[model samples]
Target: GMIISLIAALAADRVIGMENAMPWHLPADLAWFKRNTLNKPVIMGRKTFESIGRPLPGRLNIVISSQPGTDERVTWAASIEEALAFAGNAEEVMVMGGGRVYKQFLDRANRMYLTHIDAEVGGDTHFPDYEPDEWESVFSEFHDADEANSHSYCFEILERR
Candidate 1:
């Protein structure tokens, strides 16, 4: 089985997005996302894909739903099971998501790459909660706020048992 990892950037209070976009933007977080997910299959919901506007290059773009067509740039899946099946033999798959998609995959995700921004940001969408007792923090690194990143953040990698 392939590794299914959930990836997200959220505020200290668990706010994920304001209006289909991240409540805050951090260039460093973007870079970290790219570095980790490059060349890996990424699974997301249709709205999440729409917010992004296009298929991300150099990776398999698996959208939960989109118009099925011959010239489509991304692959379509109607469900999580289908998405996992469509993701070829990649050792790892990135569940780069909106809240809905994250919720669907939360129980099955093997790991989580979470960026906790140290700020109180208002948002309507929050990251779905998982039982903290099931997860073990495998690694973490902290970054201070800079000219590019408005708030200090910490990167955490947790693996589920």
Candidate 2:
């Protein structure tokens, strides 16, 4: 079985975005996002993909939606099964984005990369709440604000219990 992972960055209040865009500005967090998701079979929900404008580079982009798309740069997956199937023989696949997609794929996720932003700036989007007892945090570290980063954040890598 392929190792499925859910990756995200959210505020202390579990806020992820202000509607279609992020409420805060943290360049390093997104740098971390790109660091991990680079060159992998990554899945993005339709609206999430729309928010991005174009497909993420150096990776096979799979946008899961019923509306379907016509971009040659992006491949469409009709369902979770189809998305996973599109992962092909890869040892792992990362589901990257939108609360809708994360909630649907949470149960099947073997690992998670969650960056907890230090501030709660309010948002129109929130991540699905997960049961702490169901998973174990394998790696976690705090990153204080620097010249390139505006706010402190914590990166947590959780694995299913």
Candidate 3:
């Protein structure tokens, strides 16, 4: 679809919101994120980009900000509209986030890829609450905690209804 996609690879307990915190690692899910968004453009807020540390290779990186900053690796947009424009001719643009950025695009997002981690950890930020009626689950894959992944999790894809 030509509509934009909102991708939150995973969200866990309080610790989930603290991506930089230890115990928040997910190598397999990270790889899945890279595979899904490869060659596509990703739109995110400044805080989210900072959390990521650098531009994700293989995808165009667009950061939205009110007080713009520069990074040789990224294209900056003053607003979401400008970010979409930077998305250019791409069929689908991904909105990756910190909480605020996800809230900004929640209404317009046509699809969502969410990974639900089954542990309860502690953190300050979290995904914004939304009505389940607005989305339909399209696919899901569940995994148990093992040597590779720290916690049990399920990757689910939802389409706006």
The CA lDDT of each predicted structure is: 0.75, 0.75, 0.71
lDDT of 1 by residue, 1-161 (tens): 77899877788646464342322333444556556556889898887777778777887888897466332888889899999989989889988667888889988899887778757573566788788899999877787877865668787888997
After TM-score superposition, what is the CA distance of residue 54 in candidate 1 from its true location, in Å?
0.6
> Which segments of model 1 are wrong by more than 4 Å?
13-36, 66-71, 120-122
Return the clash pairs for model 2, or none.
Answer: none
lDDT of 1: 0.75
Residue-level lDDT of model 3, residues 1-161, one tens digit each, is: 46687766444522255354112233454555555446888898887777778887877899998875769789999877788889999978878766677778888788876767747453466676778999999877788888876778787778988
Q: Which ten residues in a row have the lowest lDDT in candidate 1?
A: 18-27
lDDT of 2 by residue, 2-108 (tens): 77988777876464653422222324435555555456788978987887788767778898989858688988988998898898987778786678888889888
Clashes of each: 0, 0, 3
For candidate 1, give the lDDT of residue 142. 83
Per-candidate TM equals 0.81, 0.83, 0.80
Cα distance off (Å), candidate 1, residue 136 = 0.4
